[PDB]
Structure 1
């Protein structure tokens, strides 16, 4: 066993009844003085390194050609001047195993952390040396972390796409289904997770040109997509991951759910395609009143009204659907469907739950389209227009397929540096650059939506780490007050940066004029309610930083009205799974699953303590499963009120609790304004 492995395992060997957390630090030293420094490839100077990486097809030469070598040297020197040290063994291990650039045979390390950060910063700046240094300082301080696709692939010749998630709308036609399968394979080839809205597809037993009971429903398309994602599995490196979203009022909703039952037959079971359910407020109202609900056949509704079932408001059209004899429907028990959802989530963690009305009551771009589904991580909530892929030799009507670039603020590092504004603006600029340089030649709706919406996702990580390292319980009202203030600041500065980009470029996102940003409605709660901290401890935490007031929000509203906004969507809180290790941060705004996690790598086992875990903050690092899910819902709703897109909200459940407890948590989330629920992980 390696020396650093033994040093890391020495953490759990208690001394005087206490964990040896400091041993972890020793491990990193070993991991660098025995493995990383020996396995790294050193050159005489930076010129030889850059030339070797360029000619050997490791780096794209275009982004490096925008800078003179003196500027690149200055950027690299700025990166190395911080003398960044990984405080935990797992941070360095995760970076050098998942994100550091290696040779073709993967026998040596070509990229250090500073090298990777410098390359990403130079790609972000697009020829601006000062901007590149700003990005270097932002990432080496670990205030901002680009998503895994962006951080791993920026400036690389053998790179994939920098966009993490893609959302596709599938129209009710064989041509559209085949095009959706093709685009899903193309985007999984690019490495991104693909989500498909199957609510427009007509249910099982519908007519294909006057011959009835002919359609296979959404389950056949689900099987096709599952095989497509199995085939396109990132060249066999990462399993192809897809998501299917169906409205709960679709007739196939049961069969949909039956794809995830552990007793499902092979002709129905789907195993590589995640499932999500979109629940309008009408379904929750029907379940609450115990009135029997009706699921609908989409094609009959489309024939009668000319629009898809998910294209209009069910809260106002459900009674018209039920009373219409030309609309076909089936009777269901909404409470039984809710119990089935809870049982499925207990068994397998599926489906994702999207509260459609919670998303669309604060959605700023309802004029473009209502949000009808979410992404594979159930945090992207954007307007999408379905595409009409016609026959060959016929022009296709290209719609809008959602796609946003992810980037997370490290809350602990951002607040320690007292740089919410600067970090938010620089992250917005980096995400705007990632969107601008993204061009996908096989997904036309994705390309058009990227060019028009200009949507980005700016997330946050290390919420629980910051709260526990500052002596604040994650479930406490003080923690929710901190989240309210911090994310109001993040939203304020993201809107300010979006408006500044719109002013400097003279262009807004497409159809911005009909948005609530243009009409000023979006700023209502910000121009009437003060989001400054209500607790003295939180206010002290925010000292040295100008917390925006109602007057600052009014000025920002006027600025947006004058100049517009460059981005249709700005903030989305992704799960941030593996890149949180490198940043020494807790995953996303979720509470920690465990204080010390035991992970098996190779034939060895390693223990990763939570960042900053110690004796004095052991009980502030409360495990998520031990927490009240209602207070976690309260925290997520408090954050969500300042996030325009959704938050990947994983439910952390105990084995003792029943499906009724899961249903109660889901209904409280819906009541509190939670937009989406990601996972039901049971301990």
Structure 2
């Protein structure tokens, strides 16, 4: 007799005379949802075998995927799938999946998939015919241990579908050709829903020459302006703005005009690269010198974006063949925070930290639209007709995440990590982005992937450890320690199985073993009793020196398949499906509210949370930056790419506050910073 699941949902938004919540009311919502809406609008077939048939016949499922398997095997899988006992844990989780993920009939009126169907098809797709693999992926996803990126989760198997990968990073070179190409990539990538970031640092600055006639270039903005229109023009079906980003080196002469667009470029996001010296200068209240990329090129034969500024600052200041401009470092960071304060951006990439941690030959000069990807890239050369004469290497992202709790809840952690790695790797292998050759090239050369984490705050709460605490820090350090061991063990394996390794391996730190010197010392003993306890209870072995030493041999000898393994992005709405917390930070709220749906909003309580443990769920605001920054650093120690890191502040905070945080971060090893969020309603 009460079947308004929204109402029921709404009830999570109520507190009783004792500041407690009717969590059950949310479970009632799930129940009414399935009963009043799903079950009734979901299609039931007489058998799976006819269902496939129909789905392929009418144009929904891609038969090419089913065809890599003996159909019996298929059926066996759907059955297992549906036999696993999967339930959604929350009304939003369900509602999200059916309103935006599950496959519907072409007219919208009926559902054709349920969570496990989708799971299955994903498993089938990535396993490319490998049945045991297919089974495992199925298992990993149904257990909650693994959660592929949205773009994969959503399209695998579908006949009419998106691409499986969808954030991309591109260079631009200081000539029109590159520029033209960039704008064209923007168009092609964004029409298909991709997020794309562009490096701008190589471009000659405002005022520089063209064809040896002085004061003629107009710098980056008018280029920013084009990319902007592109993204705005080429939305994705069912969207109005597209998403772009541009990164620019802080020491680039146009830095301030650049920052200035946000005090005008309304939809691209900005990101700024900052080397260590900049910090040095502002400390010692000094002047910042900006070098011309025009000159830099002619005198060094390389582009601004490819030299090491910190390492050649003085040199450069002294080379009179390099024009210099000066602004006040302290004011810089001031402008930086003022903007950040007004609008979240810009992101920040600690260039020196990054390159110093980079195990891969080359430098890293830019990042993605979520500031988590960090990888080398390389120039492309064109022909006057735009035809590539030299196809360089650009970057694209293959993502998925583990839900730490569920991982810890299963002793075979090595299987668990191997699978995800196997799956993301598949995503990479199946990927062939034709519209932008340099992307295709890159993928193909590197098989880079980015395995990421989520639900930390979820986990720690459940185990009664407070976010931020030494218990917490200790755990996050070792968890990531152990995840790294298995992932590289896995990539090593793959190289063996496939008998090849990523391009450049040889020049890498993996090749020489220097990549391990870190692990052959000691941290690795649980700084803490509780943490020691958790791993033990979980039946998981923390990798041991003998293990590392052995893996180091196997790597030096056999190599690894993927040039890059981990990356920790924010976990948008999949997190709700997976029932996990945004990534590894804490909980923007206890009962998160989203402005979605026919009622206006929908409410989402955190995992494992009950009236008897609320005190373990203090929100990000409440926890504040230090603790957050501290958690990410423990993680940053191991993750070869980077992690999206937001700082949440009270609306009373000041730019100095912001700046103190960024310094701390910087001082702490943090590779990069994402947006800064001032609390608002």
Normalised by the length of structure 2, the TM-score is 0.97
Distance 1:326 1:131, change over 3 A: same
Query: Which residue number in structure 1 is paired with residue 514 of structure 2?
Result: 521
TM-superposition CA deviations, 1:519-547 (whole Å, max 9, x none): 10111111112424221111221121111
- Mapped to 1, the partners of 2:275 and 2:379 lie a distance apart of 19
Query: Which residue number in structure 1 is paired with residue 591 of structure 2?
Result: 596
Query: Which residue number in structure 1 is paired with residue 316 of structure 2?
Result: 321
Shift in Å, 1:43: 1.0
Partner secondary structure for residue 459 of structure 1: strand
Query: Are the equivalent residues in 2 in contact too, given 1:532–1:549 (CA < 8 A)?
Result: no
1:551 aligns with 2:546: yes
Distance 1:206 1:40, change over 3 A: same
**Aligned equivalent of 1:304, options 299, 305, 310:** 299
TM-superposition CA deviations, 1:52-100 (whole Å, max 9, x none): 2212222221111111221111111111111211111011011111211
1:222 aligns with 2:228: no
Query: Which residue number in structure 1 is paired with residue 344 of structure 2?
Result: 349
Shift in Å, 1:104: 1.3
1:655 aligns with 2:648: no
Query: Which residue number in structure 2 is paired with residue 99 of structure 1?
Result: 101
- Mapped to 1, the partners of 2:382 and 2:23 lie a distance apart of 58
Distance 1:574 1:238, change over 3 A: farther
Query: Which residue number in structure 2 is paired with residue 265 of structure 1?
Result: none
1:626 aligns with 2:622: yes
TM-superposition CA deviations, 1:93-151 (whole Å, max 9, x none): 11111211111121111110010000000111111222111111100001010000110
Partner secondary structure for residue 529 of structure 1: coil
- Mapped to 2, the partners of 1:418 and 1:228 lie a distance apart of 49
1:194 aligns with 2:190: no
Query: Are the equivalent residues in 2 in contact too, given 1:530–1:550 (CA < 8 A)?
Result: no
Query: Which residue number in structure 2 is paired with residue 476 of structure 1?
Result: 469
**Aligned equivalent of 1:565, options 560, 563, 568:** 560
Query: Which residue number in structure 1 is paired with residue 167 of structure 2?
Result: 165
What aligned pairs does 1:15-30 form with structure 2 within 5 A after superposition? 15=16, 17=18, 18-30=20-32
1:536 aligns with 2:532: no
Query: Which residue number in structure 2 is paired with residue 156 of structure 1?
Result: 158
Query: Are the equivalent residues in 2 in contact too, given 1:530–1:549 (CA < 8 A)?
Result: no
Shift in Å, 1:393: 7.5
- Mapped to 1, the partners of 2:525 and 2:120 lie a distance apart of 36
- Mapped to 1, the partners of 2:595 and 2:421 lie a distance apart of 36
Partner secondary structure for residue 520 of structure 2: helix
Question: Gaps spanning 5+ residues in structure 1: where?
Answer: 262-268
- Mapped to 2, the partners of 1:239 and 1:142 lie a distance apart of 32
Shift in Å, 1:190: 2.6
Distance 1:178 1:129, change over 3 A: same
Partner secondary structure for residue 501 of structure 2: coil
> Which deviates further from its counterpart, 208-217 or 548-557?
208-217
- Mapped to 1, the partners of 2:396 and 2:423 lie a distance apart of 16
Shift in Å, 1:304: 1.8
> Which deviates further from its counterpart, 428-437 or 537-546?
537-546
> Which deviates further from its counterpart, 385-394 or 572-581?
385-394
What aligned pairs does 1:46-65 form with structure 2 within 5 A after superposition? 46-65=48-67
Query: Are the equivalent residues in 1 in contact too, given 2:624–2:649 (CA < 8 A)?
Result: no
- Mapped to 2, the partners of 1:547 and 1:473 lie a distance apart of 22
- Mapped to 2, the partners of 1:381 and 1:357 lie a distance apart of 12
Query: Which residue number in structure 2 is paired with residue 495 of structure 1?
Result: 488
Distance 1:434 1:655, change over 3 A: same
Distance 1:393 1:677, change over 3 A: closer
Partner secondary structure for residue 522 of structure 1: helix
Shift in Å, 1:494: 0.5
What aligned pairs does 1:215-294 form with structure 2 within 5 A after superposition? 215-237=217-239, 239-261=241-263, 269-294=264-289
TM-superposition CA deviations, 1:227-281 (whole Å, max 9, x none): 11111111343631011000001111111111111xxxxxxx1122111000011
Query: Which residue number in structure 2 is paired with residue 614 of structure 1?
Result: 610
What aligned pairs does 1:109-148 form with structure 2 within 5 A after superposition? 109-148=111-150
- Mapped to 2, the partners of 1:106 and 1:535 lie a distance apart of 54
**Aligned equivalent of 1:86, options 70, 84, 88:** 88
Query: Which residue number in structure 2 is paired with residue 11 of structure 1?
Result: 12
Query: Which residue number in structure 1 is paired with residue 581 of structure 2?
Result: 586
TM-superposition CA deviations, 1:354-413 (whole Å, max 9, x none): 000111111011x2x201011000000001112122311865211110112000001011
1:334 aligns with 2:329: yes
Partner secondary structure for residue 361 of structure 1: helix
Question: Gaps spanning 5+ residues in structure 2: where?
Answer: none
Partner secondary structure for residue 633 of structure 2: helix
Distance 1:224 1:593, change over 3 A: same
Partner secondary structure for residue 420 of structure 2: helix
- Mapped to 1, the partners of 2:387 and 2:546 lie a distance apart of 54
- Mapped to 2, the partners of 1:462 and 1:184 lie a distance apart of 33
Query: Which residue number in structure 2 is paired with residue 415 of structure 1?
Result: 408
Shift in Å, 1:460: 0.5
Partner secondary structure for residue 266 of structure 2: coil
Query: Which residue number in structure 2 is paired with residue 69 of structure 1?
Result: 71
Query: Are the equivalent residues in 2 in contact too, given 1:164–1:406 (CA < 8 A)?
Result: no
Partner secondary structure for residue 515 of structure 2: coil
- Mapped to 2, the partners of 1:395 and 1:114 lie a distance apart of 44
- Mapped to 2, the partners of 1:627 and 1:190 lie a distance apart of 38
Partner secondary structure for residue 294 of structure 1: strand
**Aligned equivalent of 1:636, options 632, 635, 640:** 632
Query: Are the equivalent residues in 1 in contact too, given 2:248–2:273 (CA < 8 A)?
Result: yes
Query: Are the equivalent residues in 1 in contact too, given 2:480–2:639 (CA < 8 A)?
Result: yes
Normalised by the length of structure 1, the TM-score is 0.97
Query: Are the equivalent residues in 1 in contact too, given 2:13–2:591 (CA < 8 A)?
Result: no
- Mapped to 1, the partners of 2:467 and 2:370 lie a distance apart of 22
Query: Are the equivalent residues in 2 in contact too, given 1:481–1:534 (CA < 8 A)?
Result: yes
What aligned pairs does 1:363-402 form with structure 2 within 5 A after superposition? 363-365=358-360, 367=361, 369-392=362-385, 395-402=388-395
Partner secondary structure for residue 647 of structure 1: coil
CA-based RMSD:
1.3
Query: Are the equivalent residues in 1 in contact too, given 2:173–2:202 (CA < 8 A)?
Result: yes
Query: Are the equivalent residues in 2 in contact too, given 1:183–1:442 (CA < 8 A)?
Result: yes
What aligned pairs does 1:412-491 form with structure 2 within 5 A after superposition? 412-491=405-484
